[model samples]
Target: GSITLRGSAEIVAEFFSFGINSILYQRGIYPSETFTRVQKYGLTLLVTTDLELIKYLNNVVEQLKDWLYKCSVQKLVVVISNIESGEVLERWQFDIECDKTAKDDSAPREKSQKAIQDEIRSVIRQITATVTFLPLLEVSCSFDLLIYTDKDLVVPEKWEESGPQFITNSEEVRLRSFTTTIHKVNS
Candidate 1:
């Protein structure tokens, strides 16, 4: 079947569901007891089952879906910081390149579901393999999730703008990336 904007949104948004939580668990940000298992994309993924936290994530990801549909977002970031020193330890960044021509084009892009799933699986595996490349975080860490979007977009309720968090002298290791015919995501 051909892929449309809506179809692309489902894949990319659900990617954040697994990709974001995989980082959370991999870094030990939250206790593992709070999460439950599910089989998706040919892998076992754990996601938070806590009621309140789950609600919050669902709301945030819901907003992301609208942004994806509108093609208004530029990127998504999750910052892992040292609580006592306020130093940014590690950050997971996803750069989104949306081909808006898909919105106006007459024909939808044709791609197989298995191909997309395989591409997504490779990226997910890299997110899980951070133990080898990244340093161990001995300091108590806190997380900050942020979104970058077009200035024309307005912030809705339950979401507020925050000041910038910048780090100048850190090394960045390139991670795997995946794409639908309409959207390209770089990690």
Candidate 2:
């Protein structure tokens, strides 16, 4: 079960691809009707069918794969803001820790693929269950994706420099995180 840098990045990006949509659907950020449910990780997950959102998610993740390959990505933040007031209501941040010991040609850890999927499943289930306790977002909100990287890394033309959009007087709940031996994510 040895994985290369490219393989690791693909797994991580795939997680985000599904993870983001789960959050959006579970949180009622988008109309439920827009998403269709599919069985994955032993759960029925709702994924968006909106062409624009799908296109945006795919583009961001494709670029993320590149950053992951370079091990330059530090964090990924999804900010939900009030469209009318421009206030950040909720922020989901995934902090990535790369294993510097991993070499380009070195063998990946002997890990079972089933084990990785189970770990990811728990994290996704936690995300889905959080709606039970987390405060309900009432405002019409839009989301923005922000990628953090090393200071010396060149910024992609598609991405621009931005400040951290913090939530004032906000309640934060740290969620579950998963790791792929190469990239350890803290949510």
Candidate 3:
């Protein structure tokens, strides 16, 4: 049987929590002292423990869960910018496609939840390994999260409309993607 929208939303939200934490640490976005090591997905991860950061992320992902239930989200972008020059340095894009046909009367197919988690783990592992070749982020950098939704979707409170902040002369690498039947998010 398939998981309901509520269940799927939680899974997607949790993935974002861990995924973002990994990137923040791997890229040295903040001082190493700011993060605390914790066990997740069979790996030790350093998660940011700063009070302000935790609060900010909590708000973003909490609102994101609601959007996941509505299945109106298009993609999530994590943009890294130079704090001094305000220039875009790197962007991590997570594209999401919802299967609207499954919203109602769609039964869960034969996929197991364990299988889904395994796929997610592989993607996280890849994100971690990317540091091997990814360029070093030496300057003081900051990140912003951008969410893309359907044209008709109402913008939530605390979120205002904004234009795409694209990086000029950028290079992109397609990464692994995972699905939870309702939402398929590619990194």
Candidate 4:
């Protein structure tokens, strides 16, 4: 099924069409067309500073959220997670471990997978009395969540262009260190 127009608004927007904004997707509405506005994505720093990528990712997230909202999104969190493939090391004027919080500032290291998962569990458990758990890899039937990843660990390349600027209305939301849970079962 496709999005159809009814009067000046959408009589019934399809369930799956909403969460498509976060990953930068565009629903096919012609340039000469007018329709109901989907739940738009707010300002995002996770996708890209590039105009096109930003637009596309926002659309995907928007579509995904709309679908889940119709079903039931009891609780939600906006998260940006960076996955490191190799041991994080500081090199070539890049501080890979700089942003990573460590007990000792001098310690040079990367977190183990177990550590990552454990952290995720703790943060989710603490946020409200809602049924909380690590967000799934895909959009799940049970909950509504958005997970995004950016390339840099300590600092994004965009930050190199501009140091830091204040966002006027934004306030302290939530920041947590979490560990991803992946384990092996004995055969």
Which scores higher on lDDT, 2 or 3? 2
Tell me the TM-score of each prediction against the true structure: 0.63, 0.61, 0.61, 0.17
Q: Please, what are the lDDT tens digits per residue for candidate 2 over residues 66-167?
A: 642465555666656655455666666664444433556656453335644675565556667787776765445656665655553454444323321222
Weakest ten-residue segment in model 1 by summed lDDT: 173-182
Model 1 misplaced regions, further than 4 Å: 1-7, 67-69, 84-86, 98-115, 132-139, 157-187
Question: Residue pairs in steric clash, candidate 2?
Answer: none
- Error at 70, model 3, angstroms: 1.6
lDDT of 1 at 127: 66
Q: How close is candidate 1 to the true structure, as a TM-score?
A: 0.63
Q: Which candidate is the best by TM-score?
A: 1
lDDT (10s digit) by residue, model 4, range 17-76: 222221212211111122234322221111113333224334433432332222112112
Residue-level lDDT for 141 in candidate 2: 62
Candidate 1, residue 107: the lDDT equals 58
User: What shift in Å separates residue 18 of candidate 3 from its native position after superposition?
Assistant: 1.2
List where candidate 2 sits over 4 angstroms from the true fold: 1-7, 41-44, 67-69, 83-86, 97-115, 132-138, 158-187
Candidate 4 similarity to native, TM-score: 0.17
Instruction: Give the Cα lDDT of each candidate.
Output: 0.52, 0.52, 0.51, 0.22
